Amino acid sequence: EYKTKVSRNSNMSKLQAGYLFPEIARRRSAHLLKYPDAQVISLGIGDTTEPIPEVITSAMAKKAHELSTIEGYSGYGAEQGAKPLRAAIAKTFYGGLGIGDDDVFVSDGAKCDISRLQVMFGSNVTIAVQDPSYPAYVDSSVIMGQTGQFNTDVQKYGNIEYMRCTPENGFFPDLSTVGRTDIIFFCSPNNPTGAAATREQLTQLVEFAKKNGSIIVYDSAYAMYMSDDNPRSIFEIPGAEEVAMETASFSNYAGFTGVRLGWTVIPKKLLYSDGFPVAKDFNRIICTCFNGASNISQAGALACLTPEGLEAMHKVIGFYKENTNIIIDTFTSLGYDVYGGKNAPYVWVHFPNQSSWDVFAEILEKTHVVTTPGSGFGPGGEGFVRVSAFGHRENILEACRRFKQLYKHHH
Amino acid sequence: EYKTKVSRNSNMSKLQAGYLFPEIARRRSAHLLKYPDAQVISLGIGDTTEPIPEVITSAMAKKAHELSTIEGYSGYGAEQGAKPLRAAIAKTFYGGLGIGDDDVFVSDGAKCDISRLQVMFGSNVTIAVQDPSYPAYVDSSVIMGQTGQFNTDVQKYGNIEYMRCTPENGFFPDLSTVGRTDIIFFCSPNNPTGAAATREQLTQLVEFAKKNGSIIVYDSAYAMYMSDDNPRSIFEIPGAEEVAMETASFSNYAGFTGVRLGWTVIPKKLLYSDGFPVAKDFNRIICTCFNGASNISQAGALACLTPEGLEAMHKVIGFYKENTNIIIDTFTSLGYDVYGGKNAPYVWVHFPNQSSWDVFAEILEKTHVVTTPGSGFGPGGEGFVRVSAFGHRENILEACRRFKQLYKHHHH
Ligand SMILES: Cc1ncc(COP(=O)(O)O)c(C=O)c1O
Ligand SMILES: Cc1ncc(COP(=O)(O)O)c(C=O)c1O
């Protein structure tokens, strides 16, 4: 066979396996070939299942129709997003926190922003992550050349600072043990533990970044699931504006997982060591590497941030929070240590003396329920399994009855 | 003021100015402050102006409504795109060229794919570009670290092979003079020159890439504007499957500039030097750095690839081709050497012995028409201005009447 003379990107070779979620999808597909009539219930990837509220879809349908008219047609939009949407985001989520419309950048989702932020930061920064955490932070770091190879003894990539988060520390790292890095990725409520940092803990985090001259990338994608009285935005901590940016999404709030609409906020006072504003470089990246979120998706997001939109999202969130309680009760009554579920739509279940890939396979084989192995979120995830609360009520109820039946005489 | 201790990305520092199109927007604004009552006509950025066909927007509205129903709701899609859409793309545009559904990757636009491909290739490859060409290829290369500093003497970033395309070489590089690189970005019909490579030229291109062991990134975003009998896909050249990929969009076909939907095709036989298939690394990128094109946008694209969708896109394209003819005739009758226009919805007008930024400024100053200076597309664009044919008919006719009044004493 012919081969080119182009060298494969050595950062791609570093990656230890495929991305977590497609690999779960692969195993689900294999299972369905093995048992074509299996009634599979999917609680692995956190994919929303309930319809998008009509007030939101009507707005998208209306925009689509307007595109067929002379007066309603629009072409390229500003890569930063429509001004009225940036304004609605700024006031709805950051009103009174000193965030301006120009600090908000509308994206086609938070996953995409994590990678565009990483292009911006470039190959020469070092990163810290919660351990466990959402796998995109680590993988985007490897892709951009910020790391060494995967070390199989400790299950870590070289040159990444993995901050230890455990049941024992309430899933917040001991910052006195964490080494200095350029960037700190911090998710609250955290995926997969469900842990939400308190005001005191976030104050420690900002003080730590300030002393270290670090940039916090704060992921608030589950913040509207907060039940405890904790801050929902990093900008609620005075001084955050000098050290932090925030990324979020409509995915988990309006069921926009397939519609594609999120945002990032980068404050005016966030500067590199030469004084250059970080926001200006992010603007260059989005003007060069992106052409804006879909106009229809933007029209949907605008409808979300109205009294009727917020009421509709609140209801959807409430439904999923009810699902979470069902799942919590099931595993608790079976005698497992169960974490999270209070401030997030998933639960983090401890399975001692088994690898989480083995647990995943066993649950899928015996109950036809898809979960997420905890090791997929980093080495501190080993021995845990994440179970999503996103599903139709009847499916959540059925998955729990399957779990109880399997584990009742054994645990 | 407080500053972090994080070093600015040295590749961002390398960039010479802002992206071209935001810079034009800046000058347009400043012009409106100077002339508050001016009736500005924009023939600058290639932004579509006519409504999307109803057959297509109806499909998008229907999908939106379906998302409000139990049965019609869908969440995350395959990051690679809906299978029926990959299948429709593969058959409509590549039927008989040996492209499978699994070789097609649906995106939210060609501009985004170019930068995702650049993340995949990484910082250690070298690139070649047409000179002139669409500025994202160069700028994405600088951002990824593939270049040296900008040299102001020659107006070029170090370590990029700029392949000069001129009236004297028929707007196709003299490949015998082009140095070896890893990647060759090649756009046909070309933006900004409008030139479409012939079957013979593309054959030379594939032969060149094969001998150099290069990967061609073929940009066909204007291929449906083809009037001459020239190939529309690189995969029409036997051997292309070993050295080429293709990136395209619905932007210029259905007015999807704001809707956001494109694709990239990477064939099975395209391998890095260690035998690893390039498509597998692109798949890792789009599964890690992207979460799929919008479901609504995909439903619109699926509706494009039907008898009714194709007829409607044909009509839209035909309207812009007629605008292009109006513009060509105007500059021709004014005594200018005018290029492109035949196979693409823009015209590449020669203004020799002037700086193109100066010509840009003069046209805007006197006629209130925005164009694009050729040097925004690289040093090989110096001496030319690109004029877009995207506009309402009355706006095209009015711009042409203003050009005629501006330039009537230049030639007899
Ligand atoms: C922790 C976390 N970060 C980022 C994302 C990416 O979200 P998006 O759907 O907007 O691309 C997700 C998925 O919802 C997530 O759970
Ligand atoms: C030559 C060329 N390539 C790529 C693009 C990007 O297209 P988009 O992101 O709208 O799909 C354009 C603009 O239409 C272009 O002119």
Describe the structure.
- The structure is a homodimer.
- The first copy, chain A, is an alpha/beta fold.
- The first copy, chain A, folds into 2 domains: 9-49 and 306-411, Aspartate Aminotransferase, domain 1 (Alpha-Beta Complex); 50-305, Aspartate Aminotransferase, domain 2, CATH 3.40.640.10.
- Helices cover 39% and strands 14% of the residues of chain A.
- Chain A is built from 13 helices and 15 strands.
- In chain A, the strands form 4 sheets. A 7-stranded mixed sheet of chain A has the order 2-10-9-8-7-3-6, sandwiched between helices. A 4-stranded antiparallel sheet of chain A has the order 11-12-15-14. A two-stranded parallel ribbon of chain A has the order 1-13.
- In chain A, strand 7 (183-187), helix 7 and strand 8 form a beta-alpha-beta unit.
- In chain A, helix 5 (110-121) runs parallel beside helix 6.
- Chain A is globular and about 60 Å long.
- The structure holds pyridoxal-5'-phosphate (2 copies).
- One pyridoxal-5'-phosphate (PLP) is lined by residues 46, 109-111, 134, 187, 191, 219, 221, 249, 251-252, 257, 262 of chain A.
- Chain A: The modification N6-(pyridoxal phosphate)lysine is found at residue 252.
